[PDB]
């Protein structure tokens, strides 16, 4: 009875307007943020805590925007590294190489045999997902098998839970390609404002959600 | 010029439960209420209205229900073909043969003029989806590009909103792969107690946003 978590971060350029704080400043307050709620979803048990980065629309931002936002994501990483087990995924062709050197670097520097892991998602997208697994296996296997698919994922398995604060119901480009089953659970909180009392809130609602797989109990 | 719904319908066992009447009454409700729901979604200019029929899943349920719930599905097109254009797709291998042969034919007898299409999926599983796209290209172009994926994915064009009631907030299999920017909709009503003015103020909730 093992369960993962994922988050979608989103609000930040929206608590920077409510603050009355530069985007840099929110950002560093949002890597405060994730580091704390790295450390909760350790205490609540889950195994995996999943961390959706970004969108590959993301990066048509400017080359100052991304690299804030790049920057206070690895600075999580910078922070945590040393007691889980990091590893990342996604469409790394479109991450600036640096990022992708130095999330290596922490990666490499992570405890592999943590019973915790922080997952860090890049450029999502299921479009470019789906077409990168094509252009991998085109004309080398005879059939693409659920082995094979699961296995070259983004996402390494199924999530169980996903919180998006920040006001929007929707999945943008971040739904995970092989959680068919996966809870959902959305809240107006910007994620820099997010409590542990709303962490646990959001449990409680997941937690108590009978889960049938499409069939009758 | 295109603007589309999808529906999840949800809740028929509990609203049997809940009126005390059986699996077959309650999916019946859920005929009537969907060619409800197709008239209010073409009454409100949605160019295609797309309903999830089925998952790979729900294929695993007793053979009982699942012809309980395929044959109320289809009674929707039996009733609204001739008035709309209908179409479906989705992972047919599991759909049952009486099924598919009926609504081929029902598919084929539709007003293929019509503004308005009634679009049905079945067996929707993301990675059933992409396993038949990557079969039927494989070894046959030098890569995948975004106008052939569309052209073949599940649900042939972005959804832009997506409507789930039943109080479930998941998609249960039925994520539409290739609709990155669809806004959704939940709510706890069953969707055989919606009500037109239900479905109004969820469009309200939708078009508020963008
Ligand atoms: C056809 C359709 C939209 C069914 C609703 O989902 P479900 O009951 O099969 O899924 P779950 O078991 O996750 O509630
Ligand atoms: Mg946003
Ligand atoms: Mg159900």
């Known amino acids: ?26 950002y560093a307050a949002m890597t405060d943020k994730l580091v704390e709620f790295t450390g909760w979803a350790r205490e609540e048990g889950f195994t995996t805590f999943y961390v959706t980065v970004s969108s590959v629309a993301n990066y048509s931002r ?10 206070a994501f690895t600075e999580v990483v910078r922070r ?28 490499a520097k992570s405890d592999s045999q943590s019973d915790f892991t922080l997952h860090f998602i890049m450029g999502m997208s299921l479009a470019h997902e ?21 296995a070259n994922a983004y996402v390494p398995e199924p999530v169980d839970f996903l919180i998006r604060p920040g006001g929007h119901v929707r999945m943008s480009s ?9 809870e959902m659970y959305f809240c107006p909180t910007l994620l820099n404002d997010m ?20 069939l009758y109990p």
Not at 63 to 70: D, I, N, P, S, Y
Not at 131 to 145: D, E, H, M, Q, S
Not at 174 to 181: K, T
């Open 1 to 26: 009875m093992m369960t993962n978590l994922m988050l979608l971060p989103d609000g930040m350029r929206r608590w920077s307007q409510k603050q009355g704080i530069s985007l840099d400043d929110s």
């Open 62 to 71: 400017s080359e100052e925007q991304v690299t804030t936002a790049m920057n």
């Open 80 to 107: 945590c590294h040393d007691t889980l087990n990091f590893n990342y995924s996604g469409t790394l062709e479109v991450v600036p190489e640096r990022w992708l050197t130095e999330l290596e670097a922490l990666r």
């Open 130 to 150: 789906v077409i990168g697994i094509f252009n991998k296996f085109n004309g080398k296997i005879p059939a693409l098998t659920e082995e094979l698919l699961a």
């Open 174 to 182: 971040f739904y995970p390609l092989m959680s068919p089953f996966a």
């Open 195 to 214: 409590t542990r009392a709303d962490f646990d809130v959001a449990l409680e609602d997941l937690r108590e959600r009978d889960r049938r797989y499409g």
